[PDB]
Amino acid sequence: DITMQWYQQLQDASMQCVLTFEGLTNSKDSQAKKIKMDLQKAATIPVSQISTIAGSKLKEIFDKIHSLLSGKPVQSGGRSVSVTLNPQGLDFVQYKLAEKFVKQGEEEVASHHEAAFPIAVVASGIWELHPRVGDLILAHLHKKCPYSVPFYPTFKEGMALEDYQRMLGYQVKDSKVEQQDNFLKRMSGMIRLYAAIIQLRWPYGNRQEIHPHGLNHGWRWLAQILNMEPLSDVTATLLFDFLEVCGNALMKQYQVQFWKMLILIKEDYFPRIEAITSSGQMGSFIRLKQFLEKCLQHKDIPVPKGFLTSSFWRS
Amino acid sequence: IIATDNVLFTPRDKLTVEELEQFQSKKFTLGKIPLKPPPLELLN
Amino acid sequence: EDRAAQSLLNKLIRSNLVDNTNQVEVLQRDPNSPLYSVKSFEELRLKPQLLQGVYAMGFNRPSKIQENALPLMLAEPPQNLIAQSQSGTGKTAAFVLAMLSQVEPANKYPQCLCLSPTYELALQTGKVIEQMGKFYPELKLAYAVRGNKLERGQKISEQIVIGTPGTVLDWCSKLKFIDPKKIKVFVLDEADVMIATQGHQDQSIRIQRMLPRNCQMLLFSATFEDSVWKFAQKVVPDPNVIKLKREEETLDTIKQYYVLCSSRDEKFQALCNLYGAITIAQAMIFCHTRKTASWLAAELSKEGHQVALLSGEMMVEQRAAVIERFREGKEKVLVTTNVCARGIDVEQVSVVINFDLPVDKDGNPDNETYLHRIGRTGRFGKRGLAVNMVDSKHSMNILNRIQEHFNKKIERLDTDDLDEIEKIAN
Ligand SMILES: Nc1ncnc2c1ncn2[C@@H]1O[C@H](COP(=O)(O)OP(=O)(O)NP(=O)(O)O)[C@@H](O)[C@H]1O
Ligand SMILES: [Mg+2]
Could you tell me if C393 and C401 are in contact, meaning their C-beta atoms sit under 8 angstroms apart?
A: no
- Cα–Cα distance between C164 and C24 in angstroms, integer? 30
Pairing of strands C141-143, C307-310: unpaired
C199/A125 Cα distance (integer angstroms): 63
Which residues, judged by CB distance below 6 Å to any ligand atom, belong to the binding site of ligand 1?
C 7, 10, 14-17, 58-59, 62-63, 87-93, 190, 222
Residue A268 touches partner B, C-beta closer than 8 Å: yes
User: What is the spatial distance between Cα A182 and Cα C355, in angstroms, rounded to a whole number?
Assistant: 28
Judged by a CB distance cut-off of 8 A, whether residue B14 touches chain A is no
> Mind giving me the DSSP string for C14-56?
--S-----SPPEEE-SSTTSPPP--SSHHHH---HHHHHHHHH
Q: Entry resolution in angstroms?
A: 3.4
Q: Do C217 and C237 touch, CB atoms closer than 8 A?
A: yes
Backbone phi, then psi, for C260, in 5-degree steps?
A: -90, 130
> Crossing angle, helix A216-226 and helix A255-264, to 10 degrees?
20
Closest-lying ligand to the alpha carbon of C189? 2
> Which domains does chain C show, CATH number per domain?
1-250 (3.40.50.300), 251-426 (3.40.50.300)
Q: How many CB atoms lie within 10 A of CB C234?
A: 13
CA separation for the pair C105, C69 (Å, rounded):
24
Residue B19: other Cβ atoms inside 10 A:
18
Which ligand has the shortest distance to the CA of C14?
1
CA-based torsion, C45, C50, C52, C56: positive or negative: negative
Q: From the CA atom positions of chain B, what is the Rg in Å?
A: 12
d(CA A311, CA C326): 19
Angle at A134 between CA C275 and CA A246, to 5 degrees: 90
Burial label, C163 (beta-carbon count in 10 A; 0-12, 13-18, 19+): buried
Please tell me the total count of domains within chain A: 1
Q: Which residues of C fall within a CB distance of 8 Å from A60?
A: 304
Domain that holds residue A144: 1-315
Q: What is the largest CA-CA distance in chain C?
A: 79
Nearest to B43 among A223, A257, A269 (CB): A257
CB C105 within 8 Å of CB C136: yes
From ligand 2's centre to the CA of C90, what distance in Å? 7
Residues C354, C343: Cα–Cα separation, whole Å: 12
Beta bridge partners of C26: C242
Q: Which atom of ligand 1 is nearest to the CA of C128?
A: 31
CA C129 – CA C10 distance, rounded (Å)? 18
Report the alpha-carbon distance of residue C372 to residue C6 in Å, rounded: 15
Spatial separation of the C-alpha atoms in residues A306 and A108, rounded to whole Å? 14
Atom of ligand 1 nearest to the CA of C60: 3
- The number of C-beta contacts closer than 8 angstroms across A and C is 83
Closest residue of A to B29, CA-based?
Answer: A264
Question: What backbone phi and psi angles, to 5 degrees, belong to C350?
Answer: -100, -25
Which residue's CA lies nearest to atom 24 of ligand 1? C87
- Per the document, the length of chain B is 44
3-class secondary structure, C389: strand
Q: DSSP label at A116? A: H
Nearest CA in chain B to A207: B3
Residues of A with CB below 8 A from C324's CB? none
> Within 10 Å of residue C362's Cβ, how many Cβ atoms?
5
**Which of B1, B2, B26, B35 is the mutation pick for testing A, counting most A CBs within 10 A?**
B35
Cα gap A51→C314, rounded to integer Å: 24
Q: Which of C300, C265, C296 is nearest to C280 (CA)?
A: C300
What whole-number distance in Å separates Cα of residue C114 and Cα of residue C228? 18
Cβ atoms C39, C107 nearer than 8 A: no
- Nearest CA owner, ligand 1 atom 11: C16
Residue nearest to atom 21 of ligand 1 (CA): C91
Quick check: A257 and B30 CB within 8 A? no
